[PDB]
Amino acid sequence: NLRVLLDTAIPPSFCDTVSSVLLDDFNMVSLIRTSPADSLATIKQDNAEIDIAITIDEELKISRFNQCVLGYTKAFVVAHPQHPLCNASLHSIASLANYRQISLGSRSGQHSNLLRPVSDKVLFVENFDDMLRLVEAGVGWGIAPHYFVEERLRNGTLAVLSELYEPGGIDTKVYCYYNTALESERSFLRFLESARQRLRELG
Amino acid sequence: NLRVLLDTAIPPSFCDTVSSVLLDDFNMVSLIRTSPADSLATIKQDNAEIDIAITIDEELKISRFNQCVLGYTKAFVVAHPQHPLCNASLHSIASLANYRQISLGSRSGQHSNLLRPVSDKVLFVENFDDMLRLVEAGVGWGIAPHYFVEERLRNGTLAVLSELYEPGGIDTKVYCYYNTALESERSFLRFLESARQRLRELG
Numbered sequence: 520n521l522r523v524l525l526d527t528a529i530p531p532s533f534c535d536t537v538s539s540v541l542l543d544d545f546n547m548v549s550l551i552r553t554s555p556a557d558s559l560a561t562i563k564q565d566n567a568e569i570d571i572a573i574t575i576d577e578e579l580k581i582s583r584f585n586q587c588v589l590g591y592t593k594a595f596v597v598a599h600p601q602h603p604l605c606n607a608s609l610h611s612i613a614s615l616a617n618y619r620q621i622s623l624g625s626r627s628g629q630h631s632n633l634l635r636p637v638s639d640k641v642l643f644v645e646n647f648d649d650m651l652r653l654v655e656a657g658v659g660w661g662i663a664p665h666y667f668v669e670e671r672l673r674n675g676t677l678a679v680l681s682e683l684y685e686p687g688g689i690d691t692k693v694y695c696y697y698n699t700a701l702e703s704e705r706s707f708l709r710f711l712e713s714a715r716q717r718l719r720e721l722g
Numbered sequence: 723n724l725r726v727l728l729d730t731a732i733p734p735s736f737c738d739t740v741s742s743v744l745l746d747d748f749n750m751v752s753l754i755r756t757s758p759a760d761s762l763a764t765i766k767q768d769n770a771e772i773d774i775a776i777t778i779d780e781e782l783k784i785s786r787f788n789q790c791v792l793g794y795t796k797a798f799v800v801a802h803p804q805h806p807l808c809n810a811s812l813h814s815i816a817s818l819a820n821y822r823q824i825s826l827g828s829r830s831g832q833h834s835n836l837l838r839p840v841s842d843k844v845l846f847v848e849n850f851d852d853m854l855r856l857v858e859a860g861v862g863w864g865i866a867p868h869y870f871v872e873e874r875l876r877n878g879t880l881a882v883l884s885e886l887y888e889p890g891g892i893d894t895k896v897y898c899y900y901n902t903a904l905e906s907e908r909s910f911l912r913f914l915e916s917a918r919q920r921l922r923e924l925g
């Protein structure tokens with residue numbers, strides 16, 4: 520039995536070739552979605568017994584878990600197209616620390632340096648749907664993955680603010696936290712190659 | 723008078739088209755090299771009066787300085803080709819926290835999450851030359867930028883360890899910290915485009 524955790528920041532298209540790869544080698548494979556904000560908190564629970572976590576969230580060393588980089592993926596800062604700074608420049612990008620942010624909350628009230636909110640006026644949600652609902656309704660601005668925002672950007676229901684900060688969108692590493700056991704395993708090596716190959720194709 | 727700080731992690735080839743761009747707009751331009759480990763510590767000193775810092779080091783917010791991403795650049799973990807884990811796998815990559823690391827030190831004894839050493843057995847230096855001297859002499863392993871390591875990798879005087887962690891080498895963002903003053907300036911916007919254009923060409 521192999522258990523795999525995928526934070527909601529990872530495109531669901533990723534989970535395709537990946538899950539196929541694992542089934543050739545492993546006979547039972549369990550896939551768990553979680554908020555990026557809960558990804559690492561979850562695998563630290565001993566009882567949870569996750570073998571592999573695939574999340575954008577970072578920490579320097581977890582107990583009995585090694586880390587490596589599968590690839591890279593783009594998030595964007597998005598708001599209502601009539602938001603106070605809807606198209607304003609690098610000036611209004613400093614100002615985001617003043618305007619209301621819609622951030623992922625976490626079961627453990629704590630947030631990593633990466634995922635911690637930037638502004639004082641913050642309002643927490645559990646998932647990127649709940650996030651972009653409030654952001655579509657001008658309640659605030661938020662950072663969501665490409666795959667969530669591509670749809671609504673076409674339709675002009677949402678506007679990007681990040682481009683002057685990071686053109687192409689905000690590149691962020693996809694990490695793979697694996698039980699130290701899987702380290703000397705041909706099984707895992709084979710999954711790593713495929714998983715990496717995969718994320719390359721999505722940009 | 724414009725003052726610009728470039729950490730030693732930035733290729734010196736970058737500083738070419740960049741310095742040219744600034745001179746069209748600005749009439750006096752001063753370029754300062756510094757250790758990545760001293761980059762941010764230096765601009766926080768009020769008396770230093772840096773207008774623009776270009777460094778790989780990250781912090782969520784400095785006083786009276788906005789941040790943005792110029793581009794991306796690759797560092798590699800390097801050691802002696804006969805180092806205990808000279809070609810060993812993802813197992814020996816966990817083990818780096820045990821073997822002696824050669825790390826950049828800092829005037830302020832403190833290090834950011836990014837640049838802080840990973841292992842217990844650490845030995846500090848001021849620059850990447852002093853680093854790769856000790857690493858060529860098998861004293862330990864270290865993380866240096868591509869441009870420092872390309873030379874010695876050809877010659878087989880150094881070996882890579884990072885590939886199983888991050889194939890292609892360890893991607894790291896080049897940040898641009900700028901005095902909030904430069905925000906509403908055509909001068910700076912023009913430099914940003916060129917500087918970004920530049921780093922794209924180096925990979």
Ligand SMILES: N#CCOc1ccc(OC[C@@H](O)Cn2cnc3ccc(Cl)cc3c2=O)cc1
Nearest residue numbers: 528594612633634635636637662663664684691
């Ligand atoms: N303008 C402009 C750009 O300046 C910014 C720099 C960092 C930011 O972080 C906000 C943080 O509270 C949440 N956060 C972070 N980094 C993420 C990366 C990927 C994904 Cl999928 C989500 C997040 C996220 O949800 C915000 C603005």
Ligand SMILES: N#CCOc1ccc(OC[C@@H](O)Cn2cnc3ccc(Cl)cc3c2=O)cc1
Nearest residue numbers: 731797815836837838839840865866867887894
């Ligand atoms: N195997 C393997 C790979 O796993 C590692 C992950 C992070 C590491 O950081 C070491 C840190 O003490 C210094 N450090 C960091 N990140 C850098 C990025 C760019 C540049 Cl130019 C230098 C550094 C650096 O000098 C080491 C290994």
